[PDB]
């Protein structure tokens, strides 16, 4: 079923900050903001961790869109091939989630990669989830009405405990 990262890195503070740093031409900025919140809350409702949004500076989880090389060691590669990537909890690059601007992204009303699904998968990595062997899992390794699977819930609660 689920996996974590080696040595089970996790956020150990009660509050973790996040920032939407850069946007996509494909959607209104407000829509990206609302879908990012919804994705974080899918995972957050299950566990004792709280997320605080910031609008400037460095936050724990930096989220954004980029083309090509963008300051980490893993440049994007134009249309196709890698779509997005995210880093396990930790200082610096840890927690950050990046999306390739050279794809097409949608809120569900157009052609594109469904941004809510993709953000829920990437932010699973930002919280410490690896990939699952269960085809039903959001954390399965390969890509409109979804929720987290039982396997996704079991793994995140294994890592953080359950929310009371």
């Amino acid at each position: 079923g689920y996996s974590l990262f080696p040595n089970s890195p996790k956020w150990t503070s009660k509050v973790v900050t996040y920032r939407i740093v850069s946007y996509t031409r494909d959607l209104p900025h407000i829509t990206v903001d609302r879908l990012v919140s919804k994705a974080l809350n899918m995972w957050g409702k299950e566990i004792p961790l709280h997320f605080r949004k910031v609008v400037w500076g460095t936050a724990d989880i930096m989220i954004g869109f980029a083309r090509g090389a963008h300051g980490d060691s893993y440049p994007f590669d134009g249309p196709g091939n890698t779509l997005a990537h995210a880093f396990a909890p930790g200082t610096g690059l840890g927690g950050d989630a990046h999306f390739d601007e050279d794809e097409r992204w949608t809120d569900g009303s157009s052609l594109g990669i469904n941004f809510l699904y993709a953000a829920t998968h990437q932010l699973g990595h930002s919280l410490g989830m690896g990939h699952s062997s269960d085809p039903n899992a959001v954390m399965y390794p390969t890509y409109q009405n979804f929720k987290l699977s039982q396997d996704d819930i079991k793994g995140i609660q294994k890592l953080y405990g359950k929310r009371s």
Partner: peptide, 5 residues
């Protein structure tokens, strides 16, 4: 893609 660092 999940990356380590």
């Amino acid at each position: 893609x999940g990356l380590v660092x």
